[PDB]
Every structure is written in structure tokens, then in C-alpha cells.
Amino acid sequence: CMKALINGTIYTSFSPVKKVSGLVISNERVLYAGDSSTALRIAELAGGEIIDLKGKFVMPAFFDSHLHLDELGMSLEMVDLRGVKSMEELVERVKKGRGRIIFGFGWDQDELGRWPTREDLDVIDRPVFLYRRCFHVAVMNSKMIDLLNLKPSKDFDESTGIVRERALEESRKIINEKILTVKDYKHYIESAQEHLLSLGVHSVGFMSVGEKALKALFELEREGRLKMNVFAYLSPELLDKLEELNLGKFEGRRLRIWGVKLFVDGSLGARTALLSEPYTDNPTTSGELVMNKDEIVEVIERAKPLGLDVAVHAIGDKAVDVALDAFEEAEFSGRIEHASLVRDDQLERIKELKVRISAQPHFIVSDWWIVNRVGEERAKWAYRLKTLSSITKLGFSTDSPIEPADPWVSIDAAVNRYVVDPGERVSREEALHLYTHGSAQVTLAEDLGKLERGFRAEYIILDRDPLK
């Protein structure tokens, strides 16, 4: 299969901006980027298909360097219960869910008139599990309670089927690890993939791939059912099985076994991101250390002879220190997910160690409470897109389903919005670069993100100029 896209405007690169008028593709790689007429002549000689763009625009497809394909799929399938006015309507909306188990979200007891309970949902004859708006609480029916077998705690009200805090976290864990099957995960991943492709995203860094998600990805790959480039960053629990086969870094046609995903800290919203000084709006806490420097170095030393990348979630400024210390000691150039707060004094270390960073520009829009958490001075550390991209390799992501998956909505954020410093905005060209080649570089994918000769031909076709 050879195709020439002619008579249009093709961006091969956004850093620096380079436009051509013709593109020849064969065996899913770019063969030629240049003159429309030269491209036409090549395809005439070799007997390829001619695609006349008719003045349309082409660009490298988006590369989301950090998301959760399984969770995105679960989220697309969930029953939408936002704005439901009565228990009667809530029950009707839940009944209209397909799954052998019905998952849903977004109810509110104020909008309902009272709290939903186990007894209200016992009219539905399959397992039901329904988040509250906040996602900090869930209600379930008896069938679902029976499947979970949770131990008694102050976070679980068995009579009403309501879970909070810890017991909700444990409920999720049991659902994900015990109850959902490999087939369920294949379906989630396929729903996410369809959604992402329709948005122009052809490659993803898939973070926190657990046992069943991996089993689903190998199956989809050999079934020819993966339609996007999936760079899988596995949970560290999978290292035992990898070491027993000596299976490490491995590139299939779509699925890549690429890395390991770790977490130093939690999030600024929950006040669990690890700060060097206490929270401005809770001076009794500085967040939580989930994995320390020695524990990260231990995983890195296991990743090294398997040729695997290591991606480390660090949100708080002190978490960033822990991640930098770990990379320094292990002499390992890893990547950092989020890097939400970066101090001036940390910049030199990031530059010198060449740490790759995956950042989510839509966090700027969503996290309006940043100044409340950390104060005016530390808010200067937040989402420093322009600064980070000028000192190291940086890529754009959504952390979907946390943020919207639509890249144009995150591009708008990176270009137009800032926490406190308008100097941290990037230009439209830079944002497109970061969401294509930037992401590719951050995911160690050297033949993605551009449409020059030799690059994998992942492109999207647009009616309007993406630079306008």
C-alpha cells in the first residue's frame, strides 16, 4: 500500500514549523515530504493511490503521553446520573445500563431529595455501583455488596450500601482486580481507543497497566484489534512475571511493553501531594509520601537490565525532589508525570539530568483552587509549561479520564491560560509541537510526532489551518 497526499498543506513539524505540499506514504512510513508534483510523479511511477487534499491541511496526529485507557473506557460506559431529580428517575436511568454490572456516577442527595440506598437499588436484578458527584462516596445494591465482601469499618454502612474514604478505595481495588474480567478490560480499552481516534489521537502513553489490562492488551494485539500505538507503562507488581521470562522492553505492531509506572505522592486537590512546607489551607499537613527515594531506586534497578523506562508521578515540590534524587542516585534518566510544582532551584537539576516531563495543560483550567492550597508565592511554581519545555523534553497529556481527552481543549489552555504568570503560556506552534513530537520524545518513540522521511505515518486531515 502506497499513497500520495497532494494539492494541500502538510505540516511535517511544529518546531520549527515546516510545511510541504505533497506527502508519499508506504508501509505506514513517510517516504517523501516535499513538492506536490514530485509526490504525484513518485506515485505515478510506483502505482500508488492519489489522494487529492483539495487545499485541506495535514498534521502529525496527536500523541497523548499519559492516560489510562482502561479507566477512560470505564468512564465512557458509565451511566450518567448528573442532574437526576428523583429516586424514580435515578432507578430508570440505572435500569437502562447494559453491563452485567452497572456502573454509574454523578448523583447528589440534594438534587434527589434524599440519599440513595441499597434498598432503592435492590429493585434492579444485577450488581450496581454508583459514585456520588465528588467520587468520594458510592452507593451499591445487595448483589454488589455480596461480590465485594468488605470487612466492617466506619467507612462502610452495610445497611445502606454506602462507602466512603478507605472502603471506597478498597471497593475500587476489588472491582478492578477481582470482579472485572479480561474481556471487560478488552471492551474498555476498545471504547477508549475509538474515542481517542475520533479526536485525532493515534498514540498514547498508557500508565499504570495492571495484570488484567496487560492480558487484554496482548489479546487485542494478536487479534489485530489494536488500532493505535500503545506504549504500556506497567504497574511494578508485574515485574516478577517479566523477570521469570526475561521479558522487558518489546515493540509489537501496536503494543509496546515500554516501562514501569510509580507514584511518589498524591494530589493537590486531596492535599496528598508532598510539599516541603505545610498547605496554606491546612497548616497541619504537608501531604503524603507514597514511595520514598530508596523504594524508587529499587524498582529502577529492576527496570535497568529489562531495558524498561520508569515514569514517576510527582505533584508536590518535595515529591519532585524525591524523584530527582532517585534518578540522580541510580544514574537513570527517567520521566516525571505532572511535575505540577517546580521551584526555581529545581530547574538546573531537571536540565542537567535531562528528565522527561509529561504535563497536563487542562489542569490550569480545572485546578482553580491552586492559590488556596499553596498560597500566592508557591503558585508561581505551578504548571510552568513554557519554562519546563525550554530546559528539557516535555510532552502534553490529559491524564484522561481526569481531564477531557480532546487535545484542542488542552491546547487552548496551554496557549491562553496561566496559574499566575502569563509568561508560562506557550505559543500555538509550541503547544502543537508538545502534543505531537514532544509527547513522542517523552515516551522514547523516536519515529513518531513528525511527518518527515522515515517517521511512522500518523496524520490527521483538517478543513482549517491548525496554526490560525
CB of 361 to Zn ion, least distance (A): 15
User: β-pairing, 394-396 with 49-52?
Assistant: unpaired
Q: Is 456:445 a contact under the CB 8 Å cutoff?
A: no
Q: Give the CB-side neighbour count of residue 417, counting CA atoms within 13 A.
A: 18
Residue with cell 528528565: 355
Nearer to Zn ion, 290 or 462 (CB): 290
The residue (of 94 and 336) whose beta carbon lies closer to Zn ion is 336
First to last CA, the chain: 33
The residue among 293 and 313 lying less far from Zn ion, judged by its C-beta, is 313
Task: For 5, list phi and psi in degrees, rounded to 5.
Answer: -95, 120
Grid cell digits, residue 464: 482549517
CB of 314 to Zn ion, least distance (A): 9
- Coil, strand, or helix at residue 315? coil
- Between 69 and 139, whose beta carbon lies closer to Zn ion? 69
What's the closest the beta carbon of residue 313 comes to Zn ion, in angstroms? 4
Residue nearest to Zn ion (CB): 313
Instruction: Work out how close the CB of 265 gets to Zn ion at its nearest, in angstroms, rounded to a whole number.
Output: 9
Q: Is the peptide bond before 466 cis (omega within 30 degrees of 0)?
A: no
Residue whose CB is less far from Zn ion, 367 or 399:
399
Query: Residue 434: is it exposed, middle or buried by C-beta count within 10 angstroms (0-12/13-18/19+)?
Result: buried
Strand partners, 462: 57
338 labelled binding-site residue? yes
Spatial distance between the Cα atoms of 87 and 112, rounded to a whole number of angstroms: 6
Alpha-carbon distance of 356 to 337, in angstroms, equals: 9
Closer to Zn ion by CB, 31 or 207: give it: 207
Question: Is 202 among the annotated ligand-binding positions?
Answer: no
Task: For residue 362, say whether it is annotated as part of any ligand binding site.
Answer: no
Nearest to 339 by CA among 367, 369, 360: 360
**Cβ at position 244, least distance to Zn ion in Å:** 28
The least distance separating Zn ion from the CB of residue 291, rounded to whole angstroms, comes to 12
Q: Is 321 in the site for Zn ion (CB under 5 A)?
A: no
| DSSP per residue, 68-83 | -HHHHHHHHHSEE-TT
- Centre a 10 Å sphere on the Cβ of residue 149 and count the other Cβ atoms it contains: 8
What is the per-residue binding string for Zn ion in 387-416, x denoting contact by CB under 5 A?
A: ------------x-----------------
| Segment interacting with Zn ion, rule: CB under 5 A, options 186-194, 231-239, 308-316, 443-451 | 308-316
Nearest-approach distance from CB 148 to Zn ion, in angstroms: 25
Window contacting Zn ion (CB under 5 A); options: 1-9, 198-206, 312-320, 382-390: 312-320
Distances (CA, A) of 143 to 102, 118, 122, 195: 11, 9, 8, 31
Cβ distance 387 to 347 under 8 Å? yes
- Our CB check for Zn ion shows the closer of 302 and 313 to be 313
Question: Least CB distance from residue 207 to Zn ion, whole Å?
Answer: 5
Q: How many residues bind Zn ion (CB under 5 A)?
A: 2
In terms of Cα–Cα distance, which of 167, 210, 199 is closest to 74? 210
Is residue 399 annotated as involved in ligand binding?
Answer: yes
Q: Is 249 annotated as a binding residue?
A: no
Binding mask 355-394 for Zn ion (x = CB under 5 A): ----------------------------------------
Least distance from C-beta 198 to Zn ion, angstroms? 22
Residue among 132, 256, 271, 313 that touches Zn ion (CB under 5 A): 313
Q: How many whole angstroms separate alpha carbon 84 and alpha carbon 334?
A: 45
Select 261 or 425, whichever has its Cβ closest to Zn ion.
261
Nearer Cβ to Zn ion (180/314): 314
The radius of gyration of the chain from alpha carbons, rounded to an integer in Å, stands at 24
Annotated binding residues for Zn(2+), as ranges? Answer: 66, 68, 261, 313, 338, 399
Binding footprint of Zn ion on the chain (CB under 5 A): 313, 399
- Binding-site annotation, residues: 66, 68, 261, 313, 338, 399
